C-alpha cells in the first residue's frame, strides 16, 4: 500500500544536443577521454525510485581547454560504462568556453560556459540527453542553458574531483 | 547551430502509482469524470522543447470527496484527449484526503493530502506516471510525496478552475 513507498527522486533535466554530437565514440574501459587528462568526474546512474541502473553507459563529448571540439576523431569523446552498482568514473580536462555568435555579429558575442555533454544509454535505448555544468565558472551568469541543478559537486579542494548523480526515467 | 536553440523546460516529475490504479479506463469525450463534477482542470501537454504534444492522453484517477476510490467501476477515472494544440480539460471533484494507516497503528493515523493521479500516454506508449497536488491543502506539510512543483495553479477559484502544464520527455529528431 501507500505507506511503504519511498518518495521519488526528481528527474535530471534534459538539455540541447548542440551541433557537435558525433555517433561512434569508442568504449573507454579506463574512462580516459584524452591524453593528459587530470580532472575526474564520478557518480551514479539511478532511476526515479532511487534504484541503480546497472550497465548504463554515458556517451560523453566536450570541448578542449581552448573551447574546440574534435570533429575528425574521438578526442574528448567516449562511452563510459557504469558498473553493476550504477557507479561511473571518467577522466578529462576542464572544458573551455567558446563563442557561438557569428564572427560579424556585433559586440559582445555570446560565449558558452564550460560544460560536458552526456547521453545516458541502457543497451540501445537512449534514456537522457543533457549537459553538466561547473560552479562559479565564466559565463554561467549569461549562458542561456546553464542550470544550477546540473552543476557538478566539488569533492575536493584541488578542483580535480567532481561528482554528479543522474536520475533517469526507466 | 547553438544560437537560436531554446532553453529546455524542466520535466514534470514522476510519482508513485499507489494501489488504486485501474487499466482500461474509458475515453471521456466531454472530459467529465463523474456525474455532478464542479472542478475543471485544464492545461497543455508539452515536450522538453516546449512544443505541444497533440493528441496526448491523460489517464486520470482520483478519490471522491470522502477520500474513497471507485474499486468496482470507472467513476472518477477516465482517459482525456489533448487537442491539436496540446490543450486538455476535464471535470471532476476536489479529491478528499484518506487514511493510509491500518487501525493497528495508534490513533495518530496518517492521511494523504488531496491529489489526482495522472498517466500521460501517446498511443500505447506511456510517457509519465505522476500526481498533481493542490495549494494550501490539508496534510501538504506532512505528506511524503507532496511536491510544490506539481501543485496546480489557480486559474479562477470562482469557477473552481485549475491549470497545469505537463512537460514530458520525447525523442527529438
Ligand atoms: Fe557544447
Ligand atoms: Fe491516491
Coordinates of C-alpha atoms and ligand atoms in Angstrom, one line a residue:
Chain A
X1 CA 0.0 0.0 0.0
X2 CA 0.9 3.7 0.0
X3 CA 2.8 3.5 3.3
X4 CA 5.8 1.5 2.1
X5 CA 6.7 3.6 -1.0
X6 CA 9.7 6.0 -0.8
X7 CA 9.5 9.5 -2.4
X8 CA 10.6 9.5 -6.0
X9 CA 13.8 11.3 -6.9
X10 CA 13.5 14.3 -9.3
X11 CA 14.5 13.6 -12.9
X12 CA 17.7 15.1 -14.2
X13 CA 16.8 17.8 -16.6
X14 CA 17.3 17.4 -20.4
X15 CA 19.4 19.9 -22.4
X16 CA 20.0 20.7 -26.0
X17 CA 22.2 18.4 -28.1
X18 CA 24.1 21.2 -29.7
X19 CA 25.8 20.8 -33.1
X20 CA 28.9 18.8 -32.0
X21 CA 27.5 15.3 -31.2
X22 CA 29.1 12.5 -33.2
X23 CA 27.9 8.9 -33.1
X24 CA 30.5 6.1 -32.9
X25 CA 32.6 7.1 -29.9
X26 CA 34.7 4.2 -28.6
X27 CA 34.1 2.4 -25.4
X28 CA 36.8 3.7 -23.0
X29 CA 37.4 0.9 -20.5
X30 CA 39.8 3.0 -18.4
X31 CA 37.5 6.1 -18.6
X32 CA 40.2 8.3 -20.1
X33 CA 38.8 10.7 -22.7
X34 CA 42.1 12.3 -23.7
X35 CA 45.8 12.4 -23.4
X36 CA 46.9 14.2 -20.3
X37 CA 43.6 14.1 -18.5
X38 CA 43.7 15.3 -14.9
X39 CA 40.0 16.0 -14.0
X40 CA 37.8 13.2 -12.7
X41 CA 34.0 13.1 -12.9
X42 CA 32.3 10.3 -10.9
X43 CA 28.8 9.4 -9.7
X44 CA 25.9 7.1 -10.0
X45 CA 23.1 6.5 -12.5
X46 CA 19.8 5.9 -10.7
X47 CA 16.2 5.7 -11.8
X48 CA 13.3 7.7 -10.3
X49 CA 12.8 5.1 -7.5
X50 CA 16.5 5.5 -6.5
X51 CA 17.4 2.1 -7.9
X52 CA 20.7 1.7 -9.6
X53 CA 20.7 1.4 -13.4
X54 CA 23.2 -1.5 -13.9
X55 CA 25.2 -1.3 -17.1
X56 CA 24.1 2.2 -18.1
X57 CA 26.5 3.9 -20.5
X58 CA 27.5 7.6 -20.6
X59 CA 28.1 8.8 -24.2
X60 CA 30.2 11.9 -23.4
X61 CA 31.6 14.7 -25.5
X62 CA 33.2 18.1 -24.8
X63 CA 35.4 20.9 -25.9
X64 CA 39.1 21.0 -25.0
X65 CA 40.6 23.8 -22.8
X66 CA 40.6 26.2 -25.8
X67 CA 36.9 25.6 -26.5
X68 CA 37.4 23.3 -29.5
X69 CA 35.6 20.0 -30.3
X70 CA 37.2 17.2 -32.3
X71 CA 35.2 17.0 -35.5
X72 CA 37.5 14.5 -37.1
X73 CA 38.0 11.8 -34.5
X74 CA 37.1 11.0 -30.9
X75 CA 39.4 13.0 -28.7
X76 CA 37.4 14.2 -25.7
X77 CA 34.5 11.8 -26.7
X78 CA 33.8 8.4 -25.3
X79 CA 31.4 5.8 -23.9
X80 CA 31.9 5.2 -20.2
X81 CA 30.2 2.1 -18.7
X82 CA 28.7 2.3 -15.3
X83 CA 29.4 -0.8 -13.1
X84 CA 26.9 -3.2 -11.6
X85 CA 26.1 -0.7 -8.8
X86 CA 25.5 2.1 -11.3
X87 CA 28.8 3.8 -10.5
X88 CA 30.7 5.7 -13.2
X89 CA 34.1 7.4 -13.4
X90 CA 35.8 9.2 -16.2
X91 CA 38.9 11.4 -16.7
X92 CA 39.0 14.5 -18.8
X93 CA 40.1 18.2 -18.9
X94 CA 38.1 21.2 -17.7
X95 CA 36.3 22.2 -20.9
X96 CA 36.9 25.7 -22.2
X97 CA 34.4 28.4 -23.2
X98 CA 33.7 29.2 -26.8
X99 CA 32.0 31.8 -29.0
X100 CA 28.6 30.8 -30.5
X101 CA 27.9 34.1 -32.3
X102 CA 28.6 34.6 -35.9
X103 CA 32.0 36.3 -36.5
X104 CA 30.4 39.5 -37.8
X105 CA 27.8 39.7 -35.1
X106 CA 28.1 42.9 -33.0
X107 CA 29.9 43.0 -29.7
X108 CA 29.6 41.5 -27.2
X109 CA 29.4 38.0 -28.7
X110 CA 27.7 35.1 -26.8
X111 CA 30.1 32.6 -25.2
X112 CA 29.1 29.3 -23.7
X113 CA 30.1 28.5 -20.1
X114 CA 32.1 25.3 -19.5
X115 CA 30.0 22.2 -19.9
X116 CA 30.2 18.5 -20.6
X117 CA 27.6 16.9 -22.9
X118 CA 26.2 13.5 -21.8
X119 CA 23.8 11.0 -23.3
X120 CA 22.7 8.2 -21.0
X121 CA 22.0 4.8 -22.7
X122 CA 20.7 1.5 -21.5
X123 CA 21.6 -1.0 -24.2
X124 CA 20.1 0.5 -27.4
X125 CA 17.7 2.8 -25.6
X126 CA 18.6 6.4 -25.0
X127 CA 17.4 7.5 -21.6
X128 CA 18.6 11.1 -21.5
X129 CA 20.4 13.8 -23.4
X130 CA 21.7 16.5 -21.1
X131 CA 24.7 18.8 -20.2
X132 CA 26.6 19.1 -16.9
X133 CA 27.9 22.5 -15.7
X134 CA 30.6 23.7 -13.2
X135 CA 30.2 26.1 -10.3
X136 CA 31.4 29.7 -10.4
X137 CA 32.6 29.4 -14.0
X138 CA 33.0 32.0 -16.6
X139 CA 29.7 32.9 -18.4
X140 CA 27.5 30.9 -16.1
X141 CA 25.6 34.1 -15.4
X142 CA 24.6 34.7 -19.1
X143 CA 24.6 31.3 -20.7
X144 CA 21.1 30.5 -21.9
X145 CA 21.1 26.9 -20.9
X146 CA 23.2 26.9 -17.7
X147 CA 21.1 25.2 -15.0
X148 CA 22.1 25.1 -11.3
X149 CA 20.5 21.7 -10.8
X150 CA 23.1 20.2 -13.2
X151 CA 26.2 21.7 -11.6
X152 CA 28.7 19.0 -10.6
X153 CA 29.7 19.0 -6.9
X154 CA 33.2 19.8 -5.9
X155 CA 34.6 16.8 -4.0
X156 CA 38.0 18.3 -3.1
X157 CA 39.9 21.5 -2.5
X158 CA 42.0 20.7 -5.7
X159 CA 39.3 21.2 -8.3
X160 CA 40.2 17.9 -9.9
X161 CA 37.4 15.7 -8.5
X162 CA 33.8 16.3 -9.3
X163 CA 30.6 14.2 -8.7
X164 CA 27.2 14.1 -10.2
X165 CA 24.3 11.6 -9.8
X166 CA 22.0 11.1 -12.7
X167 CA 18.3 10.3 -12.2
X168 CA 16.8 8.8 -15.4
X169 CA 13.3 7.7 -16.2
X170 CA 13.4 3.9 -16.9
Chain B
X1 CA 23.5 25.9 -34.6
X2 CA 23.6 26.9 -30.9
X3 CA 22.4 30.5 -31.1
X4 CA 18.7 30.1 -31.6
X5 CA 18.2 26.9 -29.8
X6 CA 15.6 27.2 -27.0
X7 CA 16.2 26.6 -23.3
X8 CA 14.6 23.3 -22.3
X9 CA 11.7 23.1 -19.9
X10 CA 12.2 21.0 -16.7
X11 CA 10.5 17.6 -16.9
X12 CA 7.4 17.1 -14.9
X13 CA 8.4 14.8 -12.0
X14 CA 7.3 11.2 -11.7
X15 CA 5.4 10.0 -8.7
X16 CA 4.2 6.7 -7.2
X17 CA 1.3 4.8 -8.8
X18 CA -0.3 3.9 -5.5
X19 CA -2.5 0.8 -5.1
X20 CA -5.7 2.1 -6.8
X21 CA -4.9 2.4 -10.5
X22 CA -7.2 0.5 -12.9
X23 CA -6.2 -0.1 -16.5
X24 CA -8.8 0.2 -19.3
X25 CA -10.5 3.4 -18.2
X26 CA -12.9 4.7 -20.9
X27 CA -12.4 7.6 -23.1
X28 CA -14.3 10.7 -21.9
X29 CA -15.0 12.9 -24.9
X30 CA -16.6 15.6 -22.7
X31 CA -13.8 15.2 -20.1
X32 CA -16.5 14.5 -17.4
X33 CA -15.0 12.1 -14.9
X34 CA -18.2 11.9 -12.7
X35 CA -21.8 13.0 -12.6
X36 CA -22.0 16.3 -10.8
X37 CA -18.4 17.4 -11.4
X38 CA -17.7 21.0 -10.3
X39 CA -14.0 21.5 -10.7
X40 CA -12.2 22.0 -14.0
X41 CA -8.5 21.0 -14.6
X42 CA -7.0 22.3 -17.8
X43 CA -3.6 22.9 -19.3
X44 CA -1.3 21.7 -22.1
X45 CA 1.0 18.7 -22.6
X46 CA 4.4 19.9 -23.9
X47 CA 7.7 18.2 -24.5
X48 CA 11.1 19.3 -23.2
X49 CA 11.5 21.9 -26.1
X50 CA 8.1 23.5 -25.2
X51 CA 6.5 22.0 -28.3
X52 CA 2.9 20.9 -27.9
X53 CA 2.2 17.1 -27.8
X54 CA -1.0 17.0 -29.9
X55 CA -3.3 14.0 -29.1
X56 CA -1.6 13.0 -25.9
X57 CA -4.0 11.3 -23.5
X58 CA -4.2 11.8 -19.8
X59 CA -5.3 8.7 -17.9
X60 CA -6.7 10.2 -14.7
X61 CA -7.9 8.6 -11.4
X62 CA -8.7 10.1 -8.0
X63 CA -10.7 9.6 -4.8
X64 CA -14.1 11.2 -4.3
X65 CA -14.8 14.0 -1.8
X66 CA -14.9 11.4 1.0
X67 CA -11.5 10.1 0.2
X68 CA -12.8 6.9 -1.4
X69 CA -11.7 5.4 -4.8
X70 CA -14.1 3.5 -7.1
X71 CA -13.0 -0.1 -6.7
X72 CA -15.9 -1.6 -8.8
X73 CA -16.2 0.7 -11.8
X74 CA -14.7 3.7 -13.5
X75 CA -16.3 6.6 -11.6
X76 CA -13.7 9.4 -11.3
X77 CA -11.5 7.6 -13.8
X78 CA -11.1 8.4 -17.4
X79 CA -8.9 9.0 -20.5
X80 CA -8.9 12.6 -21.6
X81 CA -7.5 13.6 -25.0
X82 CA -5.4 16.7 -25.6
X83 CA -6.3 18.5 -28.8
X84 CA -4.2 19.6 -31.8
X85 CA -2.6 22.4 -29.7
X86 CA -1.8 20.1 -26.8
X87 CA -4.7 21.5 -24.7
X88 CA -6.7 19.3 -22.3
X89 CA -9.5 20.0 -19.9
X90 CA -11.5 17.7 -17.6
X91 CA -14.2 18.0 -15.0
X92 CA -14.0 16.3 -11.6
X93 CA -14.4 16.9 -7.8
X94 CA -11.9 18.1 -5.3
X95 CA -10.5 14.8 -4.1
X96 CA -10.6 14.1 -0.4
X97 CA -7.9 13.0 1.9
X98 CA -7.8 9.4 3.1
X99 CA -6.2 7.3 5.8
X100 CA -3.2 5.2 4.7
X101 CA -2.8 3.6 8.1
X102 CA -4.1 0.4 9.4
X103 CA -6.2 0.7 12.6
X104 CA -3.4 -1.4 14.2
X105 CA -1.4 1.8 14.2
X106 CA -2.1 4.1 17.1
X107 CA -4.7 6.9 16.8
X108 CA -2.2 9.4 15.2
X109 CA -3.1 7.9 11.8
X110 CA -1.6 9.2 8.6
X111 CA -3.6 10.8 5.8
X112 CA -2.6 11.7 2.3
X113 CA -3.1 15.2 1.1
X114 CA -5.6 15.6 -1.8
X115 CA -4.2 14.6 -5.1
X116 CA -5.0 13.5 -8.7
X117 CA -3.2 10.6 -10.3
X118 CA -2.2 11.0 -14.0
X119 CA -0.5 8.8 -16.6
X120 CA 0.4 10.6 -19.8
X121 CA 0.1 8.4 -22.9
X122 CA 0.9 8.8 -26.6
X123 CA -1.0 5.9 -28.3
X124 CA 0.1 2.8 -26.4
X125 CA 3.4 4.4 -25.1
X126 CA 3.3 5.6 -21.5
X127 CA 5.3 8.8 -21.2
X128 CA 4.8 9.6 -17.5
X129 CA 3.2 8.4 -14.3
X130 CA 2.7 11.2 -11.8
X131 CA 0.4 13.0 -9.3
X132 CA -0.9 16.6 -9.1
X133 CA -1.4 18.4 -5.9
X134 CA -3.3 21.5 -4.6
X135 CA -2.2 24.6 -2.8
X136 CA -2.6 25.1 0.9
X137 CA -4.4 21.8 1.3
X138 CA -4.7 19.6 4.4
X139 CA -1.6 17.4 5.1
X140 CA 0.5 19.0 2.3
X141 CA 3.0 19.8 5.1
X142 CA 3.4 16.1 6.2
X143 CA 2.6 14.1 3.1
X144 CA 5.6 12.1 2.0
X145 CA 5.1 12.6 -1.8
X146 CA 3.7 16.2 -2.0
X147 CA 5.8 18.3 -4.4
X148 CA 5.3 22.0 -4.8
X149 CA 6.4 21.8 -8.5
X150 CA 3.3 19.7 -9.2
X151 CA 0.8 22.0 -7.5
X152 CA -1.9 23.2 -9.8
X153 CA -2.3 26.9 -10.4
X154 CA -5.5 28.6 -9.6
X155 CA -7.0 29.9 -12.8
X156 CA -10.2 31.3 -11.3
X157 CA -11.1 29.7 -7.9
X158 CA -14.6 31.1 -8.5
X159 CA -15.3 28.7 -11.4
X160 CA -13.1 26.3 -9.4
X161 CA -10.7 26.2 -12.4
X162 CA -7.1 24.9 -12.1
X163 CA -4.3 24.8 -14.5
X164 CA -1.2 22.6 -15.0
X165 CA 1.2 22.2 -17.9
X166 CA 2.8 18.8 -18.3
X167 CA 6.3 18.5 -19.7
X168 CA 7.2 15.0 -20.9
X169 CA 10.3 13.7 -22.5
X170 CA 10.1 12.9 -26.2
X171 CA 12.6 11.8 -28.8
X172 CA 13.9 14.9 -30.6
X173 CA 15.0 14.4 -34.2
Ligands
LIG1 FE1 28.9 22.2 -26.3
LIG2 FE1 -4.1 8.4 -4.2

